[PDB]
């Protein structure tokens, strides 16, 4: 409740609709009513057009009401959509992810049951490696650019988590 979603919606208002290429919003473990708000806001703003093919945003949504597997792989689904728009189209893509912390949190929830000795604060032993294999796909190459804005939740206001 400090303003991650308000700031990312401000960035969408300022940069996304004023953009030339395409945009991708991957909702990863957040409020479903915020996803509905975003859908209807993009419909009224002409960004998402239900009547023709002039739409400029692709939405991927696995929210906080989803089991941990869906919340762990919906970030990868959004990544894959943006990666197509970067490689096979050469476009300049905007990738918004909110929230990217739910990916790690769902990984921890499932790692509990996968029979793995837990690391610090009870997190999976493979935290940094999974985060790396996910984050190294969100990058600009010489085949296209991906301007990535990711909201990152901080547990208990601890930036050393």
């Amino acid at each position: 409740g400090v303003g991650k979603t308000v700031l990312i919606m401000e960035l969408i208002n300022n940069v996304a609709k004023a953009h030339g290429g395409y945009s991708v919003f991957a909702g990863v473990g957040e409020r479903t009513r915020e996803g509905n708000d975003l859908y209807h806001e993009m419909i009224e703003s002409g960004v998402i057009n239900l009547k023709d093919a002039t739409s400029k945003v692709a939405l991927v949504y696995g929210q906080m009401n989803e089991p941990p597997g869906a919340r762990a792989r919906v970030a990868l689904t959004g990544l894959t959509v943006a990666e197509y728009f970067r490689d096979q189209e050469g476009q300049d893509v905007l990738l918004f992810i909110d929230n990217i912390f739910r990916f790690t949190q769902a990984g921890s929830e499932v790692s509990a049951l996968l029979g793995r000795i837990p690391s610090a604060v009870g997190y999976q032993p493979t935290l940094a490696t999974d985060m790396g294999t996910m984050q190294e796909r969100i990058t600009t190459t010489k085949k296209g650019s991906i301007t990535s804005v990711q909201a990152i939740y901080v547990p208990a206001d601890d930036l050393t988590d």
Binding site: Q88, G90, K142, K143, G144
Partner: protein, 52 residues
Amino acid sequence: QTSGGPVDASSEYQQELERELFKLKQMFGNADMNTFPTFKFEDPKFEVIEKP
């Protein structure tokens, strides 16, 4: 057996090959790099420097 087809029977990827040079072209600018470069040479900015 490519002298007839120079890309060893590419059969695809030409649709994206020209995108590669385009990305490569916007990296070197926009001018047609197949001819000699033009020129316009600038001159310094001067004033009167005497005892006012």
